[PDB]
Design a protein around this ligand. Structure first.
Ligand SMILES: [Mn+2]
Length: 424
């Protein structure tokens, strides 16, 4: 079994990249705020419905002129675990499982997670905040294994009828209360806010909506417009609050969509909304879920690098100034010149700068037209994709971190973590 771990460790070595000296350590011991946008796809960015911008605040961030670096070619890599798969990957640079939920099935595995590394190396305290109860998606158990110090779950918010819609707390209340909790924290902290309102079936009380639905006739697509606007407004106000509380300028702030909100079931309506047929290649393009990052002392902009959620962990560690040579990670640092510009998807599809591989066919990204002559790097990339998924699965299925005596990681004792019931 130790041999199985050794094989994965050796496999992950070749891709390792050196940090960009422009970015290496620039955020050492600064607060890190990580903002999850439930079910958010970047087809919303710059989209108008009935003449109204769906997501005007995110549109401003996406211009690159508002201190955030926006990655328009940034993809989730989730499977059946959906939100929990995104969380898993964001904090571990590992894939979820091909079937089922890693959180639900592998919650008592040994991990060497991002929050634990930040805690150990730089004295961070890590928290998650979320307007649902802690045992949903097995978060209570998983987070203890990840070494997350605090979980402000629904018991930390007023869950009365007026404050909830669909699965739980409304995003506007959530962000307002969460900013207030964050202002009471000691630095350095690593805080992950997981939103909720922009979730299937995408329902919002009329009183809370500020944009009319689209008119495709598909209730999912049409409702998504309203919940996406609501989330955008909630986020805008959250950023305002951070500025008032002095938690904006000197924090690393990242924003990301977790996974797609609109499945292929909605191709008819999405063709109406977007004005083109949703082919398999087009659907793949629509799996862009976005990454925006603000780094203190650094200008924003637009970075066109093709990338996935696996890349976030090494990016954050390098920004902190932490040497990552001993961490078992599949991603590479977004800001490094050597960033591996190949994005595996959980189903074996993948994308690169020039082409996508979708259900056994290769398409040019320029026009989504079929490529008949196999690209020079295709075999290499296809192999990397297949092996990345297999190797990651081996870690989860073999619980392989049990066997890793890592010089740069102190084994987490999950019994040292407990999430007390909140005051509400
Ligand atoms: Mn989700």
């Amino acid at each position: 079994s130790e041999d199985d771990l050794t094989k994965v460790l050796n496999y992950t070595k070749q891709r390792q990249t050196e940090p960009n000296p422009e970015y290496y350590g620039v955020a050492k011991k600064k607060n890190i705020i990580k903002i999850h946008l439930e079910s958010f796809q970047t087809f919303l960015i710059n989209k108008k419905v009935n003449g109204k911008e769906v997501t005007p605040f995110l549109n401003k961030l996406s211009s690159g002129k508002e201190q955030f670096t926006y990655f328009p070619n940034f993809f989730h890599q989730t499977g059946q675990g959906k939100t929990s798969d995104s969380e898993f990957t964001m904090d571990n640079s590992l894939y979820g499982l091909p079937q089922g939920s890693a959180f639900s099935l592998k919650g008592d595995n040994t991990y060497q997670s991002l929050p634990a590394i930040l805690d150990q190396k730089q004295g961070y305290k890590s928290d998650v905040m979320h307007g649902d109860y802690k045992t949903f998606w097995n978060r209570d158990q998983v987070y203890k294994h990840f070494g997350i110090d605090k979980f402000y779950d629904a018991t930390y918010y007023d869950m009365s009828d007026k404050n909830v819609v669909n699965l739980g707390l409304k995003d506007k209340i959530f962000f307002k209360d969460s900013a207030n909790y964050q202002a009471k924290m000691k630095s350095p902290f690593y805080s992950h806010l997981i939103t909720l309102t922009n979730h299937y079936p995408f329902t919002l009380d009329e009183k809370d909506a500020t944009i009319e639905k689209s008119n495709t006739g598909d209730a999912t697509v049409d409702g998504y417009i309203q919940t996406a606007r609501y989330l955008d407004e909630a986020l805008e106000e959250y950023i305002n609050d951070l500025k008032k509380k002095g938690l904006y300028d000197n924090s690393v702030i990242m924003i990301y969509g977790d996974h797609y909100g609109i499945s292929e079931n909605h191709n008819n309506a999405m063709e109406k909304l977007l004005g083109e047929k949703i082919t398999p290649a087009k659907f793949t393009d629509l799996n862009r879920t976005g990454f925006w990052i603000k780094i203190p002392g650094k200008s924003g902009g637009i970075n066109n690098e093709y990338a996935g959620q696996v890349d976030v962990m090494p990016t954050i560690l390098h920004l902190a100034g932490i040497d990552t040579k001993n961490y078992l990670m599949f991603g590479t640092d977004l800001f490094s010149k050597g960033h591996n510009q190949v994005v595996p998807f959980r189903n074996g599809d993948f994308i690169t700068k020039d082409y996508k591989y979708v259900n056994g066919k290769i398409y040019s990204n320029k026009n989504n037209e079929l490529i008949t002559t196999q690209p020079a790097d295709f075999e290499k990339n296809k192999k990397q994709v297949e092996k990345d998924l297999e190797m990651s699965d081996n870690v989860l299925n073999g619980d392989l971190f049990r066997f890793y005596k890592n010089p740069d990681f102190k084994k987490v004792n999950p019994s040292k973590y407990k999430y007390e019931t909140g005051p509400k």
